[PDB]
Amino acid sequence: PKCPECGQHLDDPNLKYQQHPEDAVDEPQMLTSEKLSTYEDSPMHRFTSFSVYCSRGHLCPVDTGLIEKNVELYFSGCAKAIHDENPSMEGGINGKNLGPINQWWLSGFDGGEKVLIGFSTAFAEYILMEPSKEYEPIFGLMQEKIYISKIVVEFLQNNPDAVYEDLINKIETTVPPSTINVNRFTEDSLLRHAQFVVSQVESYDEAKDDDETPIFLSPCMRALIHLAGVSLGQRRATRPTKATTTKLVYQIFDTFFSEQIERRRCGVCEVCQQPEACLKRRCPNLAVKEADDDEEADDEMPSPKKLHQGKKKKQNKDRISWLGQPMKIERTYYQKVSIDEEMLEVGDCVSVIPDDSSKPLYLARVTALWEDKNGQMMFHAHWFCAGTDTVLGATSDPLELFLVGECENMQLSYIHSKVKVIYKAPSENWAMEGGKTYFFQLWYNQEYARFESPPKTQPTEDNKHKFCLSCIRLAELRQKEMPKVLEQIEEVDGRVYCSSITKNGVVYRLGDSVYLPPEAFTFNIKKKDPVNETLYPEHYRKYSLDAPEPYRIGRIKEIHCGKKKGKVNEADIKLRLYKFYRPENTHRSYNGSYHTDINMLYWSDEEAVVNFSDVQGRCTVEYGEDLLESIQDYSQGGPDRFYFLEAYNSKTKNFEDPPNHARSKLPKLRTLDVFSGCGGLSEGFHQAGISETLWAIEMWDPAAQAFRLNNPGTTVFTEDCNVLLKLVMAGEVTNSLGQRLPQKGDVEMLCGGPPCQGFSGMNRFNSRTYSKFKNSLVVSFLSYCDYYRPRFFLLENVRNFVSYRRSMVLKLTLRCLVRMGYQCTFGVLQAGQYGVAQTRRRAIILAAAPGEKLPLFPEPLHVFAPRACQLSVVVDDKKFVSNITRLSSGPFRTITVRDTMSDLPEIQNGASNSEIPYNGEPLSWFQRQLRGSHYQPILRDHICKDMSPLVAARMRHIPLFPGSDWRDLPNIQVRLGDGVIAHKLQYTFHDVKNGYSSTGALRGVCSCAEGKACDPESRQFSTLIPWCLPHTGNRHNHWAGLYGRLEWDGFFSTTVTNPEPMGKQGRVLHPEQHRVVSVRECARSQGFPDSYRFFGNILDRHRQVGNAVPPPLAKAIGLEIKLCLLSSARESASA
């Protein structure tokens, strides 16, 4: 038996009937009392000992949505005076069956604890005080709900941009008062109250209306919305940073504003059925999809076609005649000057009108003037590239031109008029400067988006008549690309035996070792039964390319080649090689790769023949015994350095000793690291031996402290970068704390990874979004670069920095750098490829001052999964790429979760001891490198979060097999150990898309499985299999990774900052232990030396680590900067 009015079961042991006080009088008579007397018209009163009930007398909730379901709810209690704060029945009248509740409402989400609950009846408004004794429990739940909603709203007011893991932490960390009858809130609570908490958050946005992003569109909010099946639109209750800039950087972003700066409704929701004073009827479902789609980018496009190819229109027929004496003969007669009505000579710039279509106007430099054998008057046009046409596009000066590698021969007829083109050469004192017609400053490589300093030059008397930089460039590159023979010995048949050969600038002699693709050669080569679906209801969801092999290494035995005509055929150069085996290439296979050095090989008496084309590169394979420094010293002393100690017999499968023929300063830049963090980037740079961070700016206390702990001789300014620059600029010498502020000339290198959050969107710019970016940390960072003028500059960000705002963020960043006079470029890199068991891409912007060399991007060292290696960037329908050629392969095997952490001693959930013995030697190569040569007793930071008794129970129950997650959890009752019992999941609905179990059991956890609306209180909580997972699984790929364990042969899905099992940071459970990953494990996943110090509480340390640039990637970049210094160091020393 149930209620026809409210639906409560009569058998329900929690049912309670309405009990009235003697003094009970109807509403109109109560709203007549003398006892009774803020901008409203109703009126308003206080109300105590309240009780809400159905027409039949059952006590009822108000949250449950019965008021909306047209059910008349009535209330009774003691009304009081608007100002009377006494929650005791002593000042008012007792009312009974007070008018059907029109609506209920809340107020109090800002500067106050004024969380007031109010009722609206057809007669007056009521501010509820204390409930009645019998109503207390029902109002109790309602209170728990409201309190969570407050915490969430307040947290989001001070922290938009907050991620799911921040929300969960804010909640779990907030101590509820005694008044709220709950110990502490968990993710279970939030999930349980996901519908209420979300709707109140939507309601806060309707009510407190600005122009700001609604709080329900928060990253954490949308994460909750997607995780817990929640219906949006359920309507309810009611009641400017200025970036420190240099004028040059101000103007750049100020002109873009004054120049280039100028509906799929759901139908179904309650906002979509709400007409119409009111302007906002904004669909919340559309709002989410839009916010979600703003987060994703469009990551296989053809090469961008060269400009000026291209048709041009001929001109004049008046008078064109040579002026003066010829410069030289060649079948061609070169001349310096030429009349075309007016004068024209070598070095003058001309304009050429194309075919009148998409007609900008072509501009070139007159490189040469001559008259061929056919009497045709000619000129060599070395083409310029406009302000637009470069990656910069619209962002550029309509007068700035760029030198490109585009030149062609043309008749003097095609010339329109001579144009004035000025070189905006850097000053005598350029580094100190920070604070009409055509001009050019830099050289543009289309393919790589490299803006660089011009060659300057030089024209010899031997080629003074021809001098084309664009021709010289193509020559050098044709010359370096061609396979040429250095020295030959004695030719045999058609084969000419050689002692040395060359390509790409690399010189290959005999005995030198070589890199080759895995296909280049070969070595001596070598169902499932039914599950108990009662126990595993979710397993059915389980259903429903990996890294290449590192390079083949071979030693050169014979450079034989072939021949065509009479002289040596360069098209055919061949090599006979002694094959080397990597330990994995042996009968050892996977067991080789483990404890073995990444760097070790095996000598083989095997032989192979490959073409010189296939050769990927040159490496150094030495024999272990004939070495003068330690294997470690030799190995960590230069690139492509391999080694062998034994030889492998593929036949006998044995390890014999090898045969006897198998046998045989840098300037540290003064760096300023803005947004320094705990110091990852500085560390890799320090590791490259190219820098010394003397200044670091870090706004967050824990990170700045962790930086100091690792960089003792560094002035760490625990400040906001904007305020720090303002001081220097104001003329200040030291900060408040008496710390010496760096002045112009002090900074040689300025590097930094500003956080996104501000800009952080994909859709087109607008007055609102532009203003935020106009004062972003990217803008503050560019000013630091402007003011300081470092020899080198690095900006680091999330890969998507390159896609944000229709690539406008990247274009304005590059624009700025160019204005300032800097050679600059961008590129994407994958951490994984640099020796870290983690899949993470970063956008990297490189800039170097004129005088210096613009560095190339590092070549990948480790082979990584192709899917993780999409390094290309589309800007304005053009696919940009970096100098990286190793697409594809690499010299070393992939770093795995095993290589990363297999040595660390066992810990449990909530492991709190920061200093513990290792109780074991390193096992992997990577472990050896991160642990050091010198023995250290203390293992620091093998500390992991204390997960709730529910989450802990879940982790214990996730199997150990690779790729096991939530779907593997058993549907069993678990004693949590606090009296609390993790319950079995109830499947009471038909999942129409998923079908029945093998047993014929239902797969439905909510009514929405059947296509009907969600039935609340059909919602389950504190279950081992989370209810929210089956609930939304179908529309979210079954929540694949959730409660999933990292794989030993796998890697980290991303940079983890707060390990949460149903979070947005990928597989976070340890491969074997019933816990989430420890701080130190994340530190290892990042490639931090074990000596690296961290500061603060567990989460501050987790944040520190995950925010960091992995030192291996930082070192890779740092080592490209090494070449640039060494190269510019020698090119300085001369006559």
Ligand SMILES: C[S@@+](CC[C@H](N)C(=O)[O-])C[C@H]1O[C@@H](n2cnc3c(N)ncnc32)[C@H](O)[C@@H]1O
């Ligand atoms: C993602 S981290 C960069 C990581 C760092 N490059 C590393 O390798 O460790 C961003 C850092 O910038 C700091 N930050 C944010 N706003 C800042 C500001 N206005 N001035 C200085 N630092 C700021 C943050 O507290 C955070 O440490």
Ligand SMILES: [Zn+2]
């Ligand atoms: Zn009832």
Ligand SMILES: [Zn+2]
């Ligand atoms: Zn809608």
Ligand SMILES: [Zn+2]
């Ligand atoms: Zn040329």
Ligand SMILES: [Zn+2]
């Ligand atoms: Zn549902």
